[PDB]
């Protein structure tokens, strides 16, 4: 049954709640983004209205075959009326098509549901600046002070410089990048751009990227692996056995692999700087784990919440254990006493 933190009081609405059957009283099902733990349950047999971004709507139609008559895409940064209630979708700085949702309840309460997000100071100048928010349904994935990681720009600078150095020393080196969901496309696109190559990938992954409204995409990606020297593979193949096997498939065109795994956080973060990251190597294969996050760091999350000053916080991540729930509640109170709301 549907947990409370997925239901929006005073409405017929749920958020990211497609795996519980027909939810009692739900007139509209919102989907924040196209990641499997959030869309789990959707398919071509779904017959209720789905509210989402244009990009998420492209993926529901093409990848899951949801019928068009049930897909309701909304433009961003625009006041819209859904079943009698004003809503706005805001960019969540997560994966492509990911949104936060502002609900303006008939009784005067305002609720922000962040979906999955990476907080940024630019959000302080969106439509959030313009009224009070009473209740915040918060992506708490990294809500603990140990979770530090660099900016996305520092991480991409590292990746581009590493790849261009390796391939210029050895023009017969192949670069491979792992993936298992949408998001983090900057990693492989930035590396292919510095090398003067398109990115090569499977038909299934190419289809997925063609749903994303990325400018000039036909110029950046391809299904012809033979023409490309940056390949995308499933994340599960980014290990020495999977990579040796891939190199065999390339018919002696290459003699070395440099591979990237864009992880979220890994405890190498608590000691080591981005400058200092080193790979795991076996023979002519090197694998770099790089800390490219699409969720808030602890400090980014804290700045957002202290700026927004909500009256009540509802976590949506790490809610399964009493120890986690107690830890998060303690940081919420610290933040509130430090800032004075
Ligand atoms: Ni996500």
UniProtKB/Swiss-Prot annotation:
Q: In the record, what terms sit under GO molecular function?
A: 5'-3' DNA exonuclease activity; beta-lactamase activity; damaged DNA binding; zinc ion binding
The biological processes this protein is annotated with in GO are: cell division; double-strand break repair via nonhomologous end joining; interstrand cross-link repair
Q: Which organism is it from?
A: Homo sapiens
What cellular component terms from Gene Ontology apply here?
Answer: fibrillar center; nucleoplasm
Could you say which protein family the record assigns here?
Answer: Belongs to the DNA repair metallo-beta-lactamase (DRMBL) family.
What taxonomic lineage is listed for the species of origin?
Eukaryota, Metazoa, Chordata, Craniata, Vertebrata
- Indicate where this protein resides in the cell: Nucleus
Q: Which gene encodes it?
A: DCLRE1A
Q: How does it assemble?
A: Binds constitutively to TP53BP1. Binds CDC27, which is itself a component of the anaphase promoting complex (APC). Binds PIAS1.
UniProt main location, coarse = nucleus
- Tissue expression profile of the protein: Expressed in brain, heart, kidney, liver, pancreas, placenta and skeletal muscle.
Protein name as annotated: DNA cross-link repair 1A protein
Induction of synthesis: During mitosis. The mRNA encoding this protein contains an internal ribosome entry site (IRES) in its 5'-UTR. This 5'-UTR generally suppresses translation while specifically promoting expression during mitosis, when cap-dependent translation may be impaired.
Q: What happens after mutating residue 139 to N?
A: Impaired nuclear focus formation, reduced interaction with PIAS and increased sensitivity to cisplatin
Per its database record, what is this protein's job? May be required for DNA interstrand cross-link repair. Also required for checkpoint mediated cell cycle arrest in early prophase in response to mitotic spindle poisons. Possesses beta-lactamase activity, catalyzing the hydrolysis of penicillin G and nitrocefin. Exhibits no activity towards other beta-lactam antibiotic classes including cephalosporins (cefotaxime) and carbapenems (imipenem).
Keywords from UniProt, A to Z, are:
Cell cycle, Cell division, DNA damage, DNA repair, Hydrolase, Isopeptide bond, Metal-binding, Mitosis, Nucleus, Phosphoprotein, Ubl conjugation, Zinc, Zinc-finger
């Amino acid at each position: 049954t549907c947990p409370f933190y997925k239901k929006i009081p005073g409405t017929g609405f749920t958020v990211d709640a497609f795996q519980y059957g027909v939810v009692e009283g739900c007139t509209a099902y919102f989907l924040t983004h196209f990641h499997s733990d959030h869309y789990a349950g959707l398919s071509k047999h779904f017959t209720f209205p789905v509210y989402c971004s244009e990009i998420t709507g492209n993926l529901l139609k093409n990848k899951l075959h949801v019928q068009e008559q049930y897909i309701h895409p909304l433009p961003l940064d625009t006041e819209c009326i859904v079943n009698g209630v004003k809503v706005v979708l805001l960019d969540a700085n997560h994966c492509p098509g990911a949104v936060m949702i502002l609900f303006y309840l008939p009784n005067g309460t305002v609720i922000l549901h962040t979906g999955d997000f990476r907080a940024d100071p630019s959000m302080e100048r969106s439509l959030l600046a313009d009224q009070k928010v009473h209740m915040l349904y918060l992506d708490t994935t990294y809500c603990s002070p140990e979770y530090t990681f660099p900016s996305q720009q520092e991480v991409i600078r590292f990746a581009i410089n590493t790849a261009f150095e390796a391939v210029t020393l050895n023009p017969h080196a192949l670069v491979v990048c792992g993936t298992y969901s949408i998001g983090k496309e900057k990693v492989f696109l930035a590396i292919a751009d510095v090398l003067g190559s398109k990115v090569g990938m499977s038909q299934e992954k190419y289809k997925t990227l063609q749903c994303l409204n990325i400018p000039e995409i036909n110029s950046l990606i391809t299904t012809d692996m033979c023409s490309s020297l940056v390949h995308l593979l499933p994340m599960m193949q980014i290990n020495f056995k999977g990579l040796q096997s891939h190199l065999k498939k390339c018919g002696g065109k290459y003699n070395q692999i440099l591979a990237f795994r864009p992880t979220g956080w890994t405890h190498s973060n608590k000691f080591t700087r981005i400058a200092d990251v080193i790979p795991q190597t076996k023979g002519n294969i090197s694998i770099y784990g790089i800390p490219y996050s699409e969720h808030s760091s602890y400090l980014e999350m804290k700045r957002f919440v202290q700026w927004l000053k909500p009256q009540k916080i509802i976590p949506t991540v790490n809610v399964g254990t009493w120890k986690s729930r107690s830890t998060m509640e303690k940081y919420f109170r610290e933040w509130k006493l430090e800032a004075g709301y």
